[PDB]
Design an enzyme around this catalytic site. Structure first.
Site, PDB file in Angstrom:
ATOM      1  N   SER A 223     -13.445   6.679   9.894  1.00 41.07           N
ATOM      2  CA  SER A 223     -14.317   6.912   8.539  1.00 41.07           C
ATOM      3  C   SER A 223     -14.221   8.203   7.672  1.00 41.07           C
ATOM      4  CB  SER A 223     -15.773   6.820   8.971  1.00 41.07           C
ATOM      5  OG  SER A 223     -15.936   5.560   9.396  1.00 41.07           O
TER       6      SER A 223
ATOM      7  N   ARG B  94     -20.598  15.804  17.355  1.00 42.54           N
ATOM      8  CA  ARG B  94     -19.550  16.253  16.473  1.00 42.54           C
ATOM      9  C   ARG B  94     -20.069  17.393  15.505  1.00 42.54           C
ATOM     10  NH1 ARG B  94     -18.585  10.294  14.036  1.00 42.54           N
ATOM     11  NH2 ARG B  94     -20.939  10.698  13.882  1.00 42.54           N
TER      12      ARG B  94
END
Ligand SMILES: *C(=O)N1C[C@H](NOS(=O)(=O)O)CC[C@H]1C(=O)NOCCN
Ligand SMILES: *C(=O)N1C[C@H](NOS(=O)(=O)O)CC[C@H]1C(=O)NOCCN
Ligand SMILES: [Cl-]
EC number: 3.5.2.6
Lengths: 241, 241
Positions: free
Chosen positions: A50, A226
């Site tokens: 993405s 993340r």
């Protein structure tokens, strides 16, 4: 002479804290110096997943597939697993919720020939779109490293990519993730079912720090790591409070 | 049938809790309807003070007085009372820290003839630049009401002002104040020693709420009430959590 790139393995503690492994790459724009916990992995190439919605957005805007950040992409009526995808979107919300079906439609409209030409002009990763026109960034031949993400993002920040300044400004707006009196983050997450990414930059009053991180990510349960791990590195380096 | 403007006097409790007097004006863009605690004060025209750095920035960019948001304007070396002003600034930080001497230099370079012409084109307040070109918004004849601020901001949001789209996009970037997963605020504060202002808008996933508030401000001690009171209203109306 001073080193353009320095390795700081103390950041590994932030990954091993979560029984994880990965790389954070930072670039100090004012100093023209970079820092990472893993020089080799910083330069290894992975599927962008993405994070590809950054170049995809730029190309769709520059070609007029997307007219502006207000144009509505209506939900196709197929109920998907991610609830926020089951509604109408514009460029801002499609980025924010990482709405795959909207970006697959952009890619089909762009088409193979123009997608390949644009990625070549962007010097984007290995520039290879082999695979399906609407999924090659998830399961095809394109690959990009963390240092190559930084290179691309620096061009975007400086309006130096080979698309209009307008397209670049719109995409940087759409990347807005967080802002307060201490910093602004413009970034994009990604996940290819094996690796998770977060790439972007932190704008300070008198400097900008570019970042690109990827990490081993066997399940979606840990996707918040993340940002969490990257922010622990930013806090250690005194970039954010 | 429904009215364009509705008076909601329950918001007065947010002013009286702080022993304050003032007005909050909201505009729901999707519904094309506005709301305020005091329709009369919503239409009372005041000096814009530092909220004038919005149109000033637009004009400076459109004329090339400011080349882009990264151009550095060096401190002139005069030590002023606000410490953040005694340093080099770009457009982003000049707006963030409301650096008057930078904007006074912009105004002098714009010059009175171009300033007057552009405020007429913007339909901005009473369009009156009487006084010095580099201080009329602080001690001259220009006056603007809260509803007139909303009108101006709506044009800016839609790129409908008579300057380039680029200038409008850069100024909207420089107005960024706060952003998270729930909302984005683009806004500008002002204070003229008598009243305080906060004007801007809240971007949601599927709507925009424009706002303009002003309040009586005898001393600078209560300047944080501009944002705090506005946010209490936004919270009561379920615009922000
Ligand atoms: C892109 O990386 N995506 C779409 C969506 N993005 O979430 S984010 O990683 O948090 O930005 C979810 C993950 C990923 C996928 O496409 N996941 O699906 C993989 C199998 N189709
Ligand atoms: C404008 O409203 N200003 C500039 C600065 N802004 O602070 S803010 O209200 O927090 O935006 C300080 C207050 C106010 C002034 O009165 N300064 O202008 C005169 C200084 N030469
Ligand atoms: Cl922005």
């Amino acid at each position: 002479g001073p080193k353009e790139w320095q390795e700081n393995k103390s950041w590994n503690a932030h990954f091993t804290e979560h029984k994880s492994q990965g790389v954070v790459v930072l670039w100090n724009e004012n100093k023209q110096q970079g820092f990472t916990n893993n020089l080799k992995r910083a330069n290894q190439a992975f599927l962008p997943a993405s994070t590809f919605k950054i170049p995809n957005s730029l190309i769709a805007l520059d070609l007029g597939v997307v007219k502006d950040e207000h144009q509505v992409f209506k939900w196709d009526g197929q109920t998907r697993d991610i609830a926020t995808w089951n509604r109408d979107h514009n460029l801002i919300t499609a980025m924010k919720y990482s709405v795959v079906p909207v970006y697959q439609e952009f890619a089909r409209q762009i088409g193979e020939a123009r997608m390949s030409k644009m990625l070549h002009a962007f010097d984007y990763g290995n520039e290879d779109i082999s695979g399906n026109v609407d999924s090659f960034w998830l399961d095809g031949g394109i690959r990009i490293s963390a240092t190559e993400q930084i290179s691309f993002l620096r061009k975007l920040y400086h309006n130096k990519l080979h698309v209009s300044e307008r397209s670049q400004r719109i995409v940087k707006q759409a990347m807005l993730t967080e802002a307060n009196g201490d910093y602004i983050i413009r970034a994009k997450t990604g996940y290819d079912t094996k690796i998770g990414w977060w790439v972007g930059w932190v704008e300070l009053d008198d400097n900008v720090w570019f970042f690109a991180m990827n990490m081993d990510m066997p399940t979606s349960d840990g996707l918040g790591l993340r940002q969490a791990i990257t922010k622990e590195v930013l806090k250690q380096e005194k970039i954010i409070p």
